[PDB]
């Protein structure tokens, strides 16, 4: 449940995969990357919005950091728009209607990652 690289690809590439609970973007794992690695030639964002997602497999809740990969045009695959615990821009780092590539050397948005931080 905590190691998507050991999981079924079809499972992790789904918007309903538990850790993708606040993704507004294209899943990087469908874009030539993995849940925690940018597709070749795209650059991680140093900033992100954060979700809290429930893991139904182990019953615990986890902080997930939605870093983007940046500097390539839209991946176009596995678009998700999930909104669990997402909040508007006055709670800015909980907010997913902004481009978290906004502070990168190149801000063009490529895809979104779902990085496990730890227990909520």
């Amino acid at each position: 449940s905590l190691n998507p690289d050991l999981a079924n690809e079809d499972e992790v590439n789904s918007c309903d995969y538990w850790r993708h609970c606040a993704v507004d973007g294209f899943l990087c794992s469908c874009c030539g990357g993995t849940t925690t690695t940018c597709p070749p030639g795209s650059t991680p964002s140093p900033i992100s919005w954060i979700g809290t997602c429930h893991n139904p497999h182990d019953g615990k809740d986890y902080l997930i950091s939605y870093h983007d990969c940046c500097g390539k045009t839209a991946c176009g695959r596995c678009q998700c728009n999930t909104q669990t615990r997402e909040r508007p821009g006055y709670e800015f780092f909980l907010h997913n209607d902004v481009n978290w590539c906004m502070a990168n050397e190149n801000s063009t948005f490529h895809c979104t990652t779902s990085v496990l931080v730890g227990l909520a």
């Binding site: 839209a74 997402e86 709670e91 209607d97 902004v98 190149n106």
Partner: protein, 359 residues
Amino acid sequence: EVLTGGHSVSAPQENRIYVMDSVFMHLTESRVHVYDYTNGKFLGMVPTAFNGHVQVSNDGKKIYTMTTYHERITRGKRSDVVEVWDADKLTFEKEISLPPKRVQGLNYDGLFRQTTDGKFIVLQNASPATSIGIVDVAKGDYVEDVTAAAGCWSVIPQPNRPRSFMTICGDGGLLTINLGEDGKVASQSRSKQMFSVKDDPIFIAPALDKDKAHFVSYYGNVYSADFSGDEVKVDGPWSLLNDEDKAKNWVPGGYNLVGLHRASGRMYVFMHPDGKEGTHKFPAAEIWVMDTKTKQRVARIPGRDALSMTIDQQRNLMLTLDGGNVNVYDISQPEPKLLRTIEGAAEASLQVQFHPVGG
């Protein structure tokens, strides 16, 4: 025959609407599509590069866009800009340089606005630290960075003052900024807490009257800000919901999800049943029509999966938008009447706007 250019848009300004197509699948080729709402005819377009935002000048003469370029798109130097375009010729006139931190995000109205007097463009910055930027239209210059708005988000102009606007802050209150005639902050004020950020977060989209604004919350409550005076007075909640509605878990959802018909005080809100955490951007099952004076619903109609709306006061119209299609409604009476649907107005739009006619 001879092909000619130089032509103006073929329908009068009063017939025109502006569908901001993010083209999210190809976000570097976002654009504004100009339509005639009376017959669905496509009238023209304005290219807006990466994640463009758009508004029409209050006087109806110009279109303002906000966008980001890079020298080589995906590499090279960044240029954030406002562009001024002629509204009738749909031609580029002037580029106004911005600092490289204009908001990149979905097309909420409040990210790119102007003062009531039309003399200043007021836009949201995120670096990710937030501030509000001021552009002097006459001078073609970025003139002010309102760092006082740090930790706040979006711009709600006050239609009863020439150069004043509000923003929603992390304390659950509103910061009001009054600009001088030079576009620099002339004064400011902070309201008391209007809503609990943690327990009853509001949608940023205002239902904007001349001297007050209403906001709806994730749980179907309504908050109000009265700016008839210099200090904004806040109140709420009252609930959009009766007991029956609560039984079926009706809540608001959408983006630009509310509107106000100023003559009647009717507020329009996209609503869906079976609300729970994570459903705040769900397409509308219904549009609810609320009497803001009695604080009670007067009508409900099918929502047509809409996500965003806008209101024309003078022709008593509401447009709704499901991401691709624009529905035109007559709201001259309490029950909206569907006049037509413009199919394929955009690939990925969350914002439609009428050409101003009010001057």
